[PDB]
């Protein structure tokens, strides 16, 4: 009996990706594989459970799916616990994105463009919440302590953000068996495509911290391939255009960071430059192209609204399924319900590697343990690893990250430490010292005022009591 | 034959302090002690040499004093080399303070209050010059390479700022036998005085980096003494007033840093808080008292002018000496020329410890070497040490610095690394990345403009060619 528990299974698109990958993995598509879907939103949970059951049926997979509103029941004796939950106050909100939208506006009201949580080296929208990410940190630690008692052999597969902060605090403060998951490394394939390189003929590696990873190795036909990037920068960068607001991997910002640091930032790292690329929307469009990227006052509200519409549609689709047993989800909406094709993300390959010894190369957030020698052994970094039934095996990182990149990641590590200290100390003065270092802070009184108004939002009642 | 060479002996007040301490140290006041005074300013050098000779004569000390304008002659076979030189372009300026004054004004012209060199954790005036401190770094390394050849057994006793950056780069890039000197630790005695404690009955220790040191141990009558500070904060802080612009050790800023970090910052560390204490002159007066401290647009120009007047007076006093052999410098100006009393600074005790095994406890900038375990072995820190003829012996630092102070010093260490990278790479883009992290930077174009105008100052011709 293998038990795979999805905490936050109302993330039904992500739930359906995980379910579909399991159902399409021969070693896991068995009667003895039990998938537990747990969520605090009953409508979303029900709808996700109906869609997952019908989906699995159309794939002719015999896995069992169980739904529950009990965190304890989902954790009890689980082999793998995937945390994709995004907490929210149900008295005021329907999903977590809403608390971040509203605090971001408050921040902008007080002169912080894109909110206080948008800082240098961390512009990724929704990554942290009021700096210390209290509700998301709280849930992960609660899961971690429950599983130390109820599931001591389980892996906690952390996907909800902040992955860096949460994986570090869990590891450090509970010793629970937590691993952080992010597929930002998938940006490399955009590089190979733009440079007309067969991905299978490229010898490559990335390393760093979450959303702070760099293409430390890039070789082709027995030689360094970066001169091929240099040629692309000269001849083709002038004509580059993003296909959508998320398309930044080959943007002027990415190449400007590569010029200074010596290696190419990969994936969401490109979103996390200095303020040079982010002072305002016009500056974002200069460095990221027509959309200004995804982390701005136009595109992010547009996207969160798209996700809300999708949640409502999936609830309605679940009702359609109950009314029309004969309909084929894979036929009517083949995008949402793909068939005969794995998603390509790392969660199910990880599970199949640990349990069934299907060895695979992944990029995961684990303790450094001397892999990057100029960083502490206990700091959680995003590293290239091979996973099998004997656990996680860190690759040697070669070539080493450049000196300049090392003194780029150290500040991001220190920001993590200040964020953890702000959480564990319950001390509002720590949040004030974080913002006194913010370039947008003009005065100390500005810091108190913006934090005051944030804490006084009705849905931040628990946060306010935590720091009081 | 012991040879003590003062590079920059035109710092005649500092030269006279060093000369007077030697002349009043029994083990060093000998015929075989040769003091070499070297400086590029002939008038200042001559005047310093005349005053030093007459001074030594009135102390009945037989030490030999030699003046030279040759750096090589001063370094050749020296046992100790004290670097107090402050370079300047003689085509435009008469002393080094002038290049810092003029670049600071340019910075303020472009919206950087107190100049680009005034950054968080480094508000100390004149500490760095255009971030990377090119002329001061250049001289120290030139001395370091000359002495590796001409004086392989010598100690380079670095006193010119930036002490942290220069001691680190010399150690790292040349392996020369450099030790950094700063007496900021003397602030502890202000604490003992305000709290009515006999200094000899206090068990105390400080540690950190240069201008980043903290009173990690403070005990009295077999117990922690910090509760005595707490009582002083409650009953006496409201009525505290600075005696002069340099008096900040017991200021509201110092106590506000102590509240957050858990230990008291000592000496010039109190000048180096966050921008909380430094946004403008009115804010400086709130946190430092009536004068706003010494690092502001009123008090610093007032002080540099006082030093200029003093240089002119000492030149004129030297002429008086030549005209009136019978006058007694110790009688007419006993402040400048004290008798029967050591200065209390660390340079001559250090020399007497190394050469004559007079063991003494000092606070010096040396490689960590595991003393503070959460920092690299090779990073130069300001540490409590015992010095004897067997060299430098680091005390165990106990109690350890607090967690919050550790994540305060790490950013200052990283700033040092960025400053060194800006120097060695000769890359103006590095200075631009430093300022993009500055809270006062509003745009990227602002950075280029302020650096452009700084580099284009006539006296920065060498700096401009270095970075071109
Ligand atoms: N990417 C990361 O993945 C995470 C989720 O992203 P989305 O799927 O877009 O958000 P989402 O809001 O669509 O999904 C999050 C799910 O977690 C549920 N949830 C909230 N609190 C919970 C709790 N205490 N226990 C169990 N479930 C809970 C929500 O009801 C929701 O169904 C985010 O944290 C994001 O940073
Ligand atoms: N405190 C630190 O002590 C240092 C000196 O402070 P002050 O005495 O107030 O400055 P100062 O300007 O009064 O003394 C510096 C002396 O070094 C001399 N000098 C300049 N370049 C030199 C060189 N290449 N070789 C030898 N001598 C040279 C100057 O002529 C001057 O006499 C500063 O760097 C300061 O940061
Ligand atoms: Mn991610
Ligand atoms: Mn100093």
Encode chain B in three state secondary structure.
Answer: CEEEEEECCCCHHHHHHHHHHHHCCCCCCCCCEEEEEECCCHHHHHHHHHHHHHHHHHCCCCCEEEEECCHHHHHCCCCEEEECCCCCCCCCCCCCHHHHHHHHHHHHHCCCCCCCCCECCECCCCCCCCCCCHHHHHHHHHHHHHHHHHCCCCEEEECCCCHHHHHHHHHHHHCCCEEEECCHHHHHHHHHHHCCCCHHHEEEEEEEECCEEEEEEEEECCEECHHHHHHHHHHCHHHCCCCCCCCCCCCHHHHHHHHHHCCCECHHHHHHCCHHHCCCHHHHHHHHCCCCCCCCCCHHHHHHHHHHHHHHHHHHHHHHHHHCCCCCHHHHCCCCCCCCCCCCCCHHHHHHHHHHCCCEEEEEEEECCCCCCCCCCCCEEEEEEEEECCEEEECCCCCCCCHHHHHHHHHHHHHHHHHHHHHHCCCHHHHHHHHHCCCCCCCHHHHHHHHHHHHCCHHHHHHHHHCC
Say if the Cβ atoms of A414 and B410 lie within 8 Å: yes
Chains A and B: how many Cβ contacts under 8 Å? 56
What are the φ/ψ torsions at residue A382 (nearest 5 degrees)? -95, 110
Shortest CB distance from B274 goes to which of A120, A275, A433?
A: A433
For the four alpha carbons of A141, A147, A153 and A154, in that order, the dihedral sign comes to negative
What are the distances in angstroms from CA B88 to CA A110, B39, B463?
45, 12, 12
Question: Nearest 5°: CA angle at B395, between B392 and B396?
Answer: 145
Residues of A in contact with B438 (CB under 8 A): 439
Q: Reduced to 3 states, what is the DSSP secondary structure of residue A387? A: strand
Sequence-distant (6+) residues with CB within 8 A of A194 are A232, A236, A250
CA pair distance A246, A242, nearest whole angstrom = 8
Closest residue by Cα to atom 8, ligand 1, is A11
User: Of A34, A89, A94, A183, which one is the catalytic site residue?
Assistant: A183
User: How big is chain B, counted in residues?
Assistant: 468
Compare all CA atoms of chain B with the CA of A427 and give the residue at the minimum distance: B260
Q: Domain of B360?
A: 1-468
Among B130, B131, B30, B151, which residue's Cα sits nearest to residue B83? Answer: B151
Closest residue by Cα to atom 11, ligand 2, is B11
Per-position b or e across A170-202, b if 16+ CB within 10 A of its CB: bbeebebbbbbbbbbbebbebbbeebebeeeeb
User: Count of alpha carbons within 13 Å of B230, Cβ hemisphere only?
Assistant: 7
CA pair distance A187, A257, nearest whole angstrom = 15
Distance (Å) from CA A81 to ligand 3 centroid: 18
Maximum Cα–Cα distance across chain A: 64
A406: left (phi over 0), alpha (psi -120 to 50) or beta: alpha
In this structure, what token pair is assigned to residue A191? 């590089």
Expressed in Å, this structure's resolution amounts to 2.0
In this structure, what token pair is assigned to residue B86? 């402050």
User: Count of alpha carbons within 13 Å of A320, Cβ hemisphere only?
Assistant: 12
B353: left (phi over 0), alpha (psi -120 to 50) or beta: alpha
In this structure, what token pair is assigned to residue A206? 């990335």
In this structure, what token pair is assigned to residue B174? 């040349």
- Chain A nearest-CA distance from B405, in A, is 11
Say if the Cβ atoms of B441 and A439 lie within 8 Å: yes
B215: left (phi over 0), alpha (psi -120 to 50) or beta: beta
What is residue A122's DSSP assignment? B
What is residue A237's DSSP assignment? G
CA pair distance A138, A284, nearest whole angstrom = 34
Give which of A407, A411, A413, A434 to mutate to test B binding, by max B Cβ within 10 Å: A407
Shortest CB distance from A407 goes to which of B120, B417, B438?
A: B417
CA pair distance A68, B89, nearest whole angstrom = 77
Residues of B contacting chain A (CB within 8 angstroms): 120, 260, 274-276, 279, 374, 376, 403-404, 407, 410-411, 414, 417-418, 421, 429, 433, 436-444
What are the φ/ψ torsions at residue B300 (nearest 5 degrees)? -70, -45
CA pair distance B13, B4, nearest whole angstrom = 17
Say if the Cβ atoms of A276 and B436 lie within 8 Å: yes
- Chain A nearest-CA distance from B327, in A, is 57
The torsion defined by the Cα of A339, A342, A344 and A350, in degrees rounded to 10, comes to: 140
In this structure, what token pair is assigned to residue A49? 């459970």
In this structure, what token pair is assigned to residue A258? 């590569």
User: Of B21, B79, B268, B295, which one is the catalytic site residue?
Assistant: B268
| CB-based pocket (< 6 A), ligand 2 | B 7-8, 10-11, 14, 38-41, 44, 84-88, 95-96, 126, 139, 159-161, 307
- Chain B nearest-CA distance from A297, in A, is 19
Residues of B in contact with A260 (CB under 8 A): 429, 433
- Chain A nearest-CA distance from B440, in A, is 7
Residues of B in contact with A441 (CB under 8 A): 275, 439
Give which of A405, A430, A433 to mutate to test B binding, by max B Cβ within 10 Å: A433
Question: Parallel, antiparallel, or unpaired for β B223-224 and B212-220?
Answer: antiparallel
* Helices and strands in chain A, H and E counts: 17, 12
H/E element, A365: strand A360-367
CA pair distance A193, A180, nearest whole angstrom = 28
User: Of A268, A278, A295, A347, which one is the catalytic site residue?
Assistant: A268
CA pair distance B267, B185, nearest whole angstrom = 6
| CB-based pocket (< 6 A), ligand 1 | A 7-8, 10-11, 14, 38-41, 44, 84-88, 95-96, 126, 139, 159-161, 307
- Nearest ligand 2 atom to alpha carbon B45: 32
For the four alpha carbons of B259, B260, B265 and B268, in that order, the dihedral sign comes to negative
Shortest CB distance from A444 goes to which of B260, B276, B410?
A: B276
CA pair distance A63, A80, nearest whole angstrom = 15
In this structure, what token pair is assigned to residue A24? 């399409």
Closest residue by Cα to atom 8, ligand 2, is B11
Say if the Cβ atoms of B274 and A437 lie within 8 Å: yes
Residues of B in contact with A439 (CB under 8 A): 437-441
Distance (Å) from CA B246 to ligand 4 centroid: 13
Report whether A371 contacts A362 (CB < 8 A).
Answer: no
Report whether A185 contacts A208 (CB < 8 A).
Answer: no
State the total domains in chain A: 1
Closest residue by Cα to atom 33, ligand 1, is A160
User: Of B183, B304, B388, B427, which one is the catalytic site residue?
Assistant: B183
Among A36, A40, A43, A38, which residue's Cα sits nearest to residue A22? Answer: A36
What are the distances in angstroms from CA B196 to CA B184, B190, B228, B230?
21, 10, 10, 14
CA pair distance B18, B154, nearest whole angstrom = 17
Annotated binding site of A for NADH: 11-13, 39, 44, 86, 159, 161, 181, 311
Distance (Å) from CA B95 to ligand 2 centroid: 7
Per-position b or e across A362-377, b if 16+ CB within 10 A of its CB: bbbbbbbeebbeebee
CA pair distance B78, A222, nearest whole angstrom = 54
Q: Is B261 annotated as a binding residue?
A: no
User: Count of alpha carbons within 13 Å of B42, Cβ hemisphere only?
Assistant: 1
**Does the active-site annotation cover A110?**
no
Taking each helix axis from N to C end, the angle separating B403-424 and B163-174, rounded to the nearest 10 degrees, works out to: 60
Residues of A in contact with B444 (CB under 8 A): 276, 279
- Chain B nearest-CA distance from A414, in A, is 7
In this structure, what token pair is assigned to residue B364? 């010096």
CA pair distance B365, A189, nearest whole angstrom = 48
Say if the Cβ atoms of A275 and B436 lie within 8 Å: yes
How was it solved? X-ray
Other beta carbons less than 10 A from residue A60's beta carbon:
8
Residues of A in contact with B418 (CB under 8 A): 407
What are the distances in angstroms from CA A251 to CA A231, A284, A310, A375, B419?
15, 11, 29, 29, 29
Among A181, A147, A211, which residue's Cα sits nearest to residue A350? Answer: A181
CA pair distance A162, A402, nearest whole angstrom = 25
CA pair distance B114, B107, nearest whole angstrom = 7
CA pair distance B165, B424, nearest whole angstrom = 12
CA pair distance B309, B13, nearest whole angstrom = 13
**Does the active-site annotation cover B183?**
yes
Annotated binding site of A for substrate: 161
Residues of A in contact with B429 (CB under 8 A): 260
In this structure, what token pair is assigned to residue B179? 């030790």
Distance (Å) from CA A315 to ligand 1 centroid: 16
What are the distances in angstroms from CA A390 to CA A3, A386, B448?
19, 10, 54
- Nearest ligand 2 atom to alpha carbon B48: 32
| A332 alpha-carbon distance from chain centroid | 29
CA pair distance A430, A424, nearest whole angstrom = 10
Distance (Å) from CA B184 to ligand 4 centroid: 6
In this structure, what token pair is assigned to residue B163? 């002490």
Residue A37 pairs in a beta bridge with A6, A67
């Amino acid at each position: 009996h293998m038990k795979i528990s999805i905490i936050g299974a109302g993330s039904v698109r992500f739930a359906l990706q995980l379910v579909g990958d399991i159902a399409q993995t021969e070693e896991l598509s068995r009667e003895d594989t039990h998938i537990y879907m747990m969520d605090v939103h009953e409508r979303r949970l029900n709808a996700s459970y109906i869609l997952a059951r019908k989906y699995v049926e159309e794939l002719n997979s015999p896995v069992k799916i169980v739904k529950t509103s009990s965190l304890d029941e989902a954790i009890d004796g689980a082999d793998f616990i995937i945390n994709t939950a995004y907490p929210y106050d149900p008295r005021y909100h329907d999903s977590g994105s809403q608390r971040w939208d509203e605090v971001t506006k408050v921040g902008e009201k007080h002169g912080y463009y894109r909110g206080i949580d948008s800082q240098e080296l961390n512009m990724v929208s929704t990554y942290t919440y009021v700096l210390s990410s209290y509700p998301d940190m709280k849930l992960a630690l609660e899961i971690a302590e429950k599983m130390k008692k109820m599931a001591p052999k389980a892996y906690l597969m952390q996907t909800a953000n902040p992955v860096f902060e949460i994986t570090q605090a869990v590891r450090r403060w509970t010793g629970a068996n937590i691993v952080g998951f992010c597929h930002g490394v998938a940006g490399v394939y955009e590089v190979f495509e733009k440079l007309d390189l067969d991905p299978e003929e490229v010898d490559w590696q990335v390393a760093g911290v979450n959303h702070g990873i760099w293409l430390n190795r890039f070789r082709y036909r027995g030689e360094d391939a970066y001169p091929l990037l240099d040629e692309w920068i000269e001849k083709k960068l002038p004509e580059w255009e993003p296909k959508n607001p998320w398309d930044t991997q080959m943007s002027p910002a990415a190449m400007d960071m590569y010029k200074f640091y010596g290696m190419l930032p990969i994936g969401d790292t490109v979103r996390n430059g200095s303020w040079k690329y982010h002072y305002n929307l016009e500056t974002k469009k200069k460095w990221f192209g027509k959309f200004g990227g995804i982390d701005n006052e136009v595109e992010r509200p547009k996207f969160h609204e798209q996700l809300r519409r999708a949640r409502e549609r999936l609830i309605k689709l679940a009702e359609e399924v109950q009314q029309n047993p004969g309909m084929k989800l894979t036929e009517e909406h083949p995008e949402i319900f793909p068939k005969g094709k794995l998603s390509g993300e790392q969660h199910i390959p990880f599970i199949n590697a640990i349990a069934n010894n299907k060895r695979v190369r992944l990029f995961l957030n684990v303790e450094n343990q001397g892999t990057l020698k100029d960083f502490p052994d206990d700091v959680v970094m995003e590293l290239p690893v091979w996973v099998d039934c004997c656990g996680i095996h860190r690759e040697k990182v070669e070539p080493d990250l450049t000196h300049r990149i090392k003194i780029y990641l150290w500040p991001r590590i220190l920001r993590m430490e200040w964020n953890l200290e702000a959480y564990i100390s319950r001390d509002r003065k720590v949040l004030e010292e974080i913002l006194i270092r913010d370039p947008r802070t003009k005065s100390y009184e500005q810091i108190v005022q913006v934090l005051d108004e944030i804490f006084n939002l009705p849905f931040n009642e628990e946060l306010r009591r935590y720091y009081k």
